[PDB]
Design a protein around this ligand. Structure first.
Ligand SMILES: CO[C@H]1O[C@H](CO[C@H]2O[C@H](CO)[C@@H](O)[C@H](O)[C@@H]2O)[C@@H](O)[C@H](O)[C@@H]1O
Length: 158
């Protein structure tokens, strides 16, 4: 089991960490969702599907910077939604093919009324999402840590 980003950055067997830089809607109004879809950005596969089945959860999700201070919202994982930042581990997703498959995570963040101007700064860390991988074969329990950075400023009109 291993993963990589759309940019080619890999986290190999056994886990590790990587940086993910994402483009964001440049203007978001109060009450409107800023969508951060990582399913187009993070992909993983199973390295021996002939015998092994891999199980993958969103172990933890944390907020930082302008997201921590200026937004509230949710994370959607494989079709179900939970409060973000997270308070518990999600149910698992099955990986059973060598063909790369999206990690089905997306953030839905809405600006608070009191925010004004630039709510997220270009190049700043906005979130850390931890992928946890186990299997039905041995005692492997590996974590893949994705550090999510903003490519551009996000503006909230007051
Ligand atoms: C067939 O067993 C051989 O390969 C196993 C490879 O283990 C990696 O891939 C598994 C399937 O994606 C994943 O579950 C595991 O955590 C590793 O990422 C290895 O464990 C066996 O020991 C043997 O080498």
């Amino acid at each position: 089991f291993a993963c990589k980003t759309a940019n080619g950055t890999a986290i190999p067997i056994g886990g590790g960490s990587a940086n993910v830089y994402v483009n964001l809607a440049p203007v978001v109004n109060v009450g409107q969702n800023l969508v951060v879809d990582l399913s187009t950005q993070i992909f993983c596969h199973n390295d021996y599907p002939e015998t092994i089945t891999d199980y993958v959860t969103l172990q933890r999700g944390s907020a930082y910077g302008g997201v921590l201070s200026n937004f509230s919202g949710t994370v959607k994982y494989s079709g179900s939604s939970y409060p973000f930042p997270t308070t518990s581990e999600t149910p698992r997703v099955v990986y059973n093919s060598r063909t790369d498959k999206p990690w089905p995570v997306a953030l839905y963040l809405t600006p608070v009324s009191s925010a004004g101007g630039v709510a997220i700064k270009a190049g700043s860390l906005i979130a850390v999402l931890i992928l946890r991988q186990t299997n039905n074969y041995n005692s492997d329990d590996f974590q893949f840590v994705w550090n999510i950075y903003a490519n551009n400023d996000v503006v909230v009109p007051t």
